[PDB]
Design a protein around this ligand. Sequence first.
Ligand SMILES: N[C@@H](CCC(=O)N[C@@H](CS)C(=O)NCC(=O)O)C(=O)O
Ligand SMILES: N[C@@H](CCC(=O)N[C@@H](CS)C(=O)NCC(=O)O)C(=O)O
Lengths: 209, 209
Amino acid sequence: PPYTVVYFPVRGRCAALRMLLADQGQSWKEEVVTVETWQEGSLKASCLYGQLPKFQDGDLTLYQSNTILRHLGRTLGLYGKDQQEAALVDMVNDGVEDLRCKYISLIYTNYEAGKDDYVKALPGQLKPFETLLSQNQGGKTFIVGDQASFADANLLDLLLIHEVLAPGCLDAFPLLSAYVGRLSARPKLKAFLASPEYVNLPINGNGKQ
Amino acid sequence: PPYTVVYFPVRGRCAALRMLLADQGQSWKEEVVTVETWQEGSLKASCLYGQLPKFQDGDLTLYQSNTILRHLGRTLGLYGKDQQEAALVDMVNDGVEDLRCKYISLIYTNYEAGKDDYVKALPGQLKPFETLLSQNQGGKTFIVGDQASFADANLLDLLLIHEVLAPGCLDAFPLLSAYVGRLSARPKLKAFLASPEYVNLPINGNGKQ
Ligand SMILES: N[C@@H](CCC(=O)N[C@@H](CS)C(=O)NCC(=O)O)C(=O)O
Ligand SMILES: N[C@@H](CCC(=O)N[C@@H](CS)C(=O)NCC(=O)O)C(=O)O
């Protein structure tokens, strides 16, 4: 650190890393970039892949939401207790990323038309995580092992935004439901989740959710 | 190990991890799954995310192509010399994954219609890697640091399949071009790349490239 998050005024792909920071009692700065400032071109051109989030950690500059998560993960000790757990953490995060991509596709590509089918296929998309939970201490702790990993933050966010998209989509998944309530109850995380810093930011940038 | 790759008879998302194994002098088994065997349902139903590749390493079973790459990476010492390089390796791999996803989209979604635009936007998509190369020892060594990382294998594959899609797409990028020739020249990798094991496998599963 110091940590600096450069992003649009939305939760989007920074929601998980923000929860991770808050949960771990870390302090950071939010550098807000408006859509008008972005259309000016300057910043976009200076971005490695021409996109945000951009993350500053001391003299280190990173791009890619999952790179930021893994960086915080290996640097803060949220990346498994050993090499085997590390692989499982990755396997979870990759699964989360795959579904997040379909979700982002729905939101910005064809929300009105595709929402129904998307929701029909939703349970098959969530089942894997319920399964992973059931194979780890009956899903009583975290997604991998008995300690938090950056994959928890990313999975938790995925679940939270899908409950908004399709309320009760977790009722059919006992472990996932209990997992969400348990994590959301963690003091610092709970505080953050209830703060205007989170609540007053839309989930996505096109007003859809 | 022993390593076992369970995948369809295509290069696809296993190409990079295969080059990595070969380049590092590792031995492994190829478990081929035909489309017919897949349509029977049994295997697919048992896969965490209902997809392949599936990777076996001793009693460890993994899924997700990038999870396999990172697993081989941290286990074989191809994941940066320190935490900072590790982050950069991730940043590179995430960029590779983003473009691979658009590539896979083109190939299986609308190859005939979208190919032209895709190719128009190609240089802007490759520029970032040329830039990363230029900022690391003038691009004389690897994508990150002076040692190989799993990101090299993934980036190399991305470049190779794009030269097939749009020949000469690398002519405008000096470092990327020299980088490809240099890596492709490594003895074991060169041997592997010239073997029927690689050559006689199509790049994708729908006959398009
Ligand atoms: N794979 C990247 C995706 C980044 C991305 O999609 N960024 C969007 C906002 S969520 C963006 O910068 N859009 C503006 C643009 O493409 O010009 C990541 O994981 O962060
Ligand atoms: N994100 C996964 C994607 C896996 C994937 O797309 N697998 C395809 C083959 S490349 C598949 O199994 N298709 C058959 C199906 O979905 O039933 C990874 O990185 O491996």
